[PDB]
Amino acid sequence: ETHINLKVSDGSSEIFFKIKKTTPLRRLMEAFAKRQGKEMDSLRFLYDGIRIQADQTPEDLDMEDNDIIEAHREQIGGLTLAVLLQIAEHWATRDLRQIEDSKLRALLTLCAVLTRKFSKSQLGLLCETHLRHEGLGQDQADSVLEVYQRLHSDKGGNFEAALWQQWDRQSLIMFISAFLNIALQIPCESSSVVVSGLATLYP
Amino acid sequence: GLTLAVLLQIAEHWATRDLRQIEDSKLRALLTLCAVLTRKFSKSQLGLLCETHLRHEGLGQDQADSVLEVYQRLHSDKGGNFEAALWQQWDRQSLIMFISAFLNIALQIPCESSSVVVSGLATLYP
Secondary structure, eight states, X not given: OOEEEEEEEOSSOEEEEEEETTSOTHHHHHHHHHHTTOOGXXXXXXXXXXXXXXXXXXHHHXXXXXXXXXXXXXXXXXXXXXXXXXXXXXXXXXXXXXXXXXXXXXXXXXXXXXHTTSOGGGHHHHHHHHHHHHTOOGGGHHHHHHHHHHHHTOTTSHHHHHHHHHSOHHHHHHHHHHHHHHHTTSOSSOOOHHHHGGGGGOO | OOOHHHHHHHHHHHHTOOOTTOOHHHHHHHHHHHHHHHTTSOGGGHHHHHHHHHHHHTOOGGGHHHHHHHHHHHHTOOXXXXXXXXXXXXXXXXXXXXXXXXXHHGGGSOSOOOHHHHHHHXXXXX
């Protein structure tokens, strides 16, 4: 047999291929990614638990007829919530007048990402706590809520970008620093009987 | 005070717990915990979560749509609506299994994927 049948699967979508044993696996990888509407490089492919490369052949790998290749989504970066909270806690105490624009831009992103980890129903408390942290008054409530609300729903990253272009540095610094302090102390869901249920799970 | 930090502490503790004898009220609360934590992932991460969950559990293709739907509907949930329906509709073993798999895979998966986001935040690690 100069040919081999192989299945590529990601657990949901599976595809039954046939190729020649001396042909690189690239074309199968490309056809599978294409069917998920993805770029080949957004996926990785494993055989017998081992990542394999597009230039390798079923022959080099001692594949057997009807063997299975697993398609796995790439894990790009390691930004767990745990890691984001470490970053926030580190920067919360820092004087930001010092830092490069590149770090400030990234901190803006951190505030936007972390804002989106609060339920909608907490944005009011987040606003009110922001005001009390800064010593601002009800005069500013609408403007602060609108920032948080717009970040919370900022799907394109477009509002975040506008904030970076339109706000002066001192204003950005004041807001970012306010947020990083209050965000770690405020509950991420509102009260309810169901959320009180979580109390029974505390160690 | 269910802070982000406290949410993760609860999840970390319960990922290590044997649920053989789990009480109904505790199971109900674990469902809430999983629903809340699911919503800390960006929508773009749901596919990776589902994929990891299928593989962790040895679930077939036949069950892929179903596990994904649960993830999508927890993620888009409002006022505990879908969560409450899951509690009523699913048998106890199925819920336990789902919750136990979630807690064992969720804590190592990034909560954001965007190239824009990962690139930016890299610079901020101590």
